Ligand binder design. Structure first.
Ligand SMILES: N[C@@H](CCC(=O)N[C@@H](CS)C(=O)NCC(=O)O)C(=O)O
Ligand SMILES: [Zn+2]
Length: 400
């Protein structure tokens, strides 16, 4: 059924000859391909700026609204060094700070996005007072939603991402580790409790749920949570890593379909969705991180299988976005490239970029938010710009 959701891939797979046009022997993009990426970025940015004039004033979130556009412009500033991008970022940050709703704690869908992005932007503009005020508010945000879920879009790991984002960008421990530690402890406790309650324990020591489904994928599910729990940033003990997280990861691995794709939720039998939010393009992060941490070959094997699924079925009729689109899917190739140093995967990313370079010419669905970071054009632009330096590329608002 995956075939129904994707365009046939029109490209030849890797060989040293097809690859030479895109990058050299060191994996460094050619000047010509770099420029073509840059040219498309500039073109799409014009369309994005115009389109955003019609966007909902009230949505300031990273996922669909203003803070997400600021994330893009902070990135473009880092890639290109044009001060105009920093200025654009400031405008979008100010809009997002007028949109706080106090309903959610995450970087992508709650108030943490505006606050964490503003903290970093203010820091980059040497505005210490504003930066520090945003950090205070970000720290205090914890208190507004105890009993949050554990997942990326609405739950604890989405809040953690915001804290990590500030610390990374300041290059200093602005948010105390003990703040991250207490959240991590709540996540682990919650997972053990639910596994115990439902008698998953023997097969999976941890279990999580969102809107009464055992979601599997990165956005709302297990793969997202375990990817986080395996991160050195969260400082989970070796003890818990081996006794709790590893067997829970293995349980997810065993959910794999014959195709190499993953179900959206435990017991959901449809092999249909090839997205970051649901399926192989989001589960691959858990696999790659599992490999880095546990060094078991099976995780790498599964990751290769993900990449092949995505190579076959990853050019989505849904469009070019990050959450569920070709650009988000392309990031799966980059993560596997960055693990293995296998240029085959850099090549596949470049071909997905080629597809995005024909933006709007395939008859794709128009997204609900056509210009946003996660559904729309801002995210496609983000990917194109990130590809410029492949070894530093990271899926935004998610990958560490
Ligand atoms: N609002 C989305 C459309 C909805 C969508 O694609 N939702 C994702 C989850 S974030 C999904 O996997 N939907 C289920 C499906 O495609 O069958 C957009 O305009 O891009
Ligand atoms: Zn999605």
């Amino acid at each position: 059924h995956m075939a129904q959701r994707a365009f046939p891939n029109p490209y030849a797979d890797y060989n040293k000859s097809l690859a030479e046009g895109y990058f050299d022997a060191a994996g460094r993009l050619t000047p010509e391909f770099s420029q073509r990426l840059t040219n498309k970025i500039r073109e799409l940015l014009q369309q994005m700026e115009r389109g955003l004039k019609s966007a909902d004033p009230r949505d300031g979130t990273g996922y669909t609204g203003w803070a997400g556009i600021a994330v893009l412009y902070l990135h473009l500033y880092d890639v290109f060094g044009d001060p105009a991008y920093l200025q654009l970022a400031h405008g979008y940050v100010k809009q997002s700070l007028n949109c706080l709703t106090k309903r959610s704690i995450t970087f992508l869908c709650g108030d943490a996005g505006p606050l964490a992005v503003a903290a970093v932007l203010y820091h980059k503009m040497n505005n210490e007072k504003q930066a520090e005020d945003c950090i205070t508010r970000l720290i205090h945000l914890n208190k507004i939603d105890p009993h949050a879920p554990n997942e990326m879009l609405y739950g604890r790991i989405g809040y953690i991402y915001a804290l990590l984002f500030v610390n990374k960008n300041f290059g200093v421990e602005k948010i105390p580790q003990s703040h991250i530690q207490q959240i991590c402890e709540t996540i682990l406790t919650s997972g053990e409790n639910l596994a115990r309650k439902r008698n998953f324990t023997a097969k999976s020591p941890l279990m999580y749920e969102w809107y009464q489904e055992y979601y599997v994928g990165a956005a709302h599910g297990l793969a997202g949570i375990y990817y986080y729990l395996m991160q050195p940033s969260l400082q989970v003990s070796q003890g818990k890593l081996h006794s709790l997280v590893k067997p829970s990861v293995d349980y997810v691995c065993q959910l794999k379909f014959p195709s190499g794709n993953y179900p959206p939720a435990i017991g959901d039998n449809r092999d249909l969705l090839v997205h970051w939010c649901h399926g192989a393009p989001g589960v691959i992060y858990m696999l790659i991180q599992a490999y880095k941490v546990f060094r078991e070959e099976k995780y790498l094997c599964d990751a290769y299988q993900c990449a092949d699924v995505i190579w076959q079925y990853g050019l989505l009729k849904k469009g070019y976005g990050l959450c569920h689109g070709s650009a988000g899917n392309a990031y799966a190739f980059l993560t596997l490239y960055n693990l293995t140093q296998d240029m085959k995967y850099l090549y596949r990313a470049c071909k997905f970029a080629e597809w995005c370079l024909e933006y709007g010419e395939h008859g794709c669905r128009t997204p609900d938010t056509p210009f946003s970071l996660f559904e729309g054009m801002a995210g496609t632009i983000y990917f194109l710009a990130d590809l410029l330096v492949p070894t530093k590329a990271r899926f935004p608002a998610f990958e560490l």
